[PDB]
Design a protein around this ligand. Sequence first.
Ligand code: ACP
Lengths: 288, 285, 286, 283
Amino acid sequence: ELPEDPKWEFPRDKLTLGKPLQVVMAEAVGIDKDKPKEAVTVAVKMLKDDATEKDLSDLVSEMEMMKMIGKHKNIINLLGACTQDGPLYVIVEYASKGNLREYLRARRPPGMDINRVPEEQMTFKDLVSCTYQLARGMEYLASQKCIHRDLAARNVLVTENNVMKIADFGLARDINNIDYYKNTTNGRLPVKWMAPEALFDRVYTHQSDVWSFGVLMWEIFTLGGSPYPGIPVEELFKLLKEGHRMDKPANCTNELYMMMRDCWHAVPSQRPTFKQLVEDLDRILTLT
Amino acid sequence: GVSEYELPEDPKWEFPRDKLTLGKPLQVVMAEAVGIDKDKPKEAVTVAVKMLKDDATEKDLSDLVSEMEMMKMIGKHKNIINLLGACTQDGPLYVIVEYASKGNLREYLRARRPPGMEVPEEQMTFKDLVSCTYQLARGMEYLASQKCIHRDLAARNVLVTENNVMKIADFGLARDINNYYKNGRLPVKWMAPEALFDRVYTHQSDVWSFGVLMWEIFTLGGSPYPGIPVEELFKLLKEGHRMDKPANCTNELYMMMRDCWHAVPSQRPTFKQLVEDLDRILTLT
Amino acid sequence: GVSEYELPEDPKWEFPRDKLTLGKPLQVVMAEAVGIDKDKPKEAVTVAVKMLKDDATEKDLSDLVSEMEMMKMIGKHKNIINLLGACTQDGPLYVIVEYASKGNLREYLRARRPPGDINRVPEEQMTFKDLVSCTYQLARGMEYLASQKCIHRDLAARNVLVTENNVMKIADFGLARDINNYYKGRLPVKWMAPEALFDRVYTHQSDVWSFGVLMWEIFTLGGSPYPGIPVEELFKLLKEGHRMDKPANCTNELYMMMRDCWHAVPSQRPTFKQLVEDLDRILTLT
Amino acid sequence: ELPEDPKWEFPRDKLTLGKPLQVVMAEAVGIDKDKPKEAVTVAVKMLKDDATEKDLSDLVSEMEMMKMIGKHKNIINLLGACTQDGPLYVIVEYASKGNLREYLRARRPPGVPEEQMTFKDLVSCTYQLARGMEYLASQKCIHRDLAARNVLVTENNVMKIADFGLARDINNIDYYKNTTNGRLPVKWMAPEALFDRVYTHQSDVWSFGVLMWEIFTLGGSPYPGIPVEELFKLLKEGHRMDKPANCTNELYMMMRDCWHAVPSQRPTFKQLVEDLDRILTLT
Ligand SMILES: Nc1ncnc2c1ncn2[C@@H]1O[C@H](COP(=O)(O)OP(=O)(O)CP(=O)(O)O)[C@@H](O)[C@H]1O
């Protein structure tokens, strides 16, 4: 039911599946023509045994979006797929340190909750670097006219040298040649990261992603905190209509907090663009 | 919808938040509700509470509301998990349901597989399994009589309590079809052919699902269509593919399964018929 | 001893390895034994198997051996876990015993406490009478044990198993000893009688003290003894005469029974025969 | 009772117990005198509610042994202890990657998983551990319970020998005398200890051999398929584990040297370090 795409097709016999991280770790022999005989560790996304029709179409769409998005340092990259005779396997780059939320919580400074890595406590500069890298990834994404729609710390992967990689393009959409994407009435986007236009007007643009980026920044500087703490989603709707905004994370410069607030401007066009975010973050990073 | 939306007040079902103490997670958490039974106003009763998570989407809230509404109009029955109330006003939505002491059927069954099969628990007798099937048929028969389609019938969605009592659960995808129901969110391996190929869902679609449930029961929690990816199932069902008979399952019960998997909905038995047959098979067992 | 050592043959208790199929751990694992009951040769019966682990020590082996031997020597009784057989020849030592489908008493009691900590079974909520019945059944088990001149030394709710029919069965004879003709520290401190340490002696009266602690666990529905008090401080406290408070909703009559059990002087504590008699009356009146 | 030792005593109010890893994670403010108000994550060892007299005597012994071993990069170090007015707390260094056995089983090749050990990484692990033992032996201390499960891995793949509950000081004595039926896992026990109840640094060398086998099998279980009760006889008959797949004959021969029936004929930890350093370099 899925026509072949020779450019990305990967031979199943060259793929050995491992334990799940549904995404499972795996070994792909020569998924990089450069090193024909070299086996490399990769992550494989597949369907669960109880998958729905929508899960299959979501995995396909996700695979195709990654093809069109292109390659960037701060984006988890697609390496191939097994789409013929057999279960659909979307093969992507493996990120050894998991998602950013867990990554940060694990290396929070002592004083003030699972595995811990003190030799990696986050310095303020590390946090700013994380934010700058992510702004760079989004800037590239937007330049490719793609909206992510599900940007959050849980959807950012961290690889070897604390390199941030945007991931999880299951809800991403291409808005080339259209002014904005039209969300369904009751979408599948986590509400706490949703821009107001999306939530109330069902409209989605790059500036909507900028809003999400603001919540992500708050996650970063709270070292993995959960947005709008103590506020259930059902009560958030009203609060947002009344302009509610999260306060400054402890141990965060007023400058960075103001950046978050700019990201949460009620007027989309009045929020910075990812291009401006990168420019400002680069400066802030440079200083520090 | 969900965002600029506000849950109305429903007296007979509302339950005070100060009277509910959320417990440990079973999103569903265990909990204690004082007076949920208006006949024992001082009695703290243990119950299960379904609520939204922090990362909830608009559709999650929409589904929880729908689930709650479906349960209100389904009425009591011993083989169906029933609604005890809800905290809808001023605060997060809490759907209070009855607590099942033994967990979901799928795991309940895998726990008691024979040593060397595929914390352990005492094996199940054939009579026990037949009984489980019977009760489930009785639960669905009542559900169909209330003109409700469950659509997500599976072992993972049946709760076990007391003395091997079966209680149909999770009405998150259930629909009221009084006065059929036109990318599905239903697990493919439990889906009737017409559900996709024709975008239609009736009680006869639920009967197909019941068949798969029976297979799960007699394979002691096995995964349907083992080794076959969901993406290939489409074709196979079309060619007439059907699951093999579970080991140690009477031919009589397996034929019941096959009847349930008739391509044409009108050629599958009705839950009334299944209840009658199963009632006899249980007696003879 | 364990290393350069070989287990003697005992045809009476020996069970064929080829007729035992090991299951998953409950090390004790569930298993199916065909013909363990020589009267139903073709019947496969669910049993529990105690065996050594990969990282077992020499002491683990000798302890397993003595545990098995103690059970052979104690003899049958309704309130004591039953030894069904053993695979001692040519291969790992497997001590086969009766399977108790409801688990250990501590967890059993905790799962059915009344409202107001894992799985709950409200439909089997403990009534005052059930607790008395449990204490009684256990009194009878220990009375029988004493009559066989065997001290348990490790009596505790975690070492009591409850069958599907809610029958109390004394278990874990890993530390049990035969004192036929006292026994001059691997015993959990909070269940230990004063003379056990301070005097290095152990008699049936030591087991009676433990029984008292067990009673307390029963009536607090699986509570932890001396809550908030570390084992290292217990020593001193018992010396000053410290004793646990009465469990909530426990009759004073039963609490006095507990205190009698905790008499500093062993000879001043009741005997299991006396406990059985008293408990038999209290049960009937309840 | 337990007389105070000001040198190691740490105030209880400065320690905040955390989730368990019995051993729990914790935060100790100023556990480093050089870092006054600086809080640091550590691991606290304590007794369980059902502890025996022996459990307590062992925890005390564990602490005292650590108080005399001294510090070394490849040994989990003692930081302090709360011994007065309250439960006994042995405060030790926190290892961020858990124990070596699981650390390795998770690093196994496909066919929660983790990347993967290169042969060089395994050799480095082995070398670091030989270094830790060499220091231990130089301190005239026998570990007696050396195994992958008792090695902790921290931050940057640094091996730290841990669990000194069975460790003993043999300064001024030719060998330690084991109890008849000891509490030492048999599969890691040198024959002299098992059959003759004698224990020397060379007995630890034997255990090191089994440890090597664990490392190169990426966390495999020694004498696979052989129950402890059958191992006794096999060892009397000179049984020895075969070469782990994907292991150089050179490293396997090192293991075999470690399992020489004659203690003095086994390499010393000093020789092991020397040889491993060379092998590591050529790798
Ligand atoms: N014959 C039997 N039938 C059923 N369950 C049994 C059993 N023998 C033991 N068990 C259960 O299996 C559990 C695990 O066995 P094991 O003997 O290893 O524990 P243990 O007694 O050493 C631990 P503790 O007493 O500290 O909880 C026991 O705690 C008990 O609950």
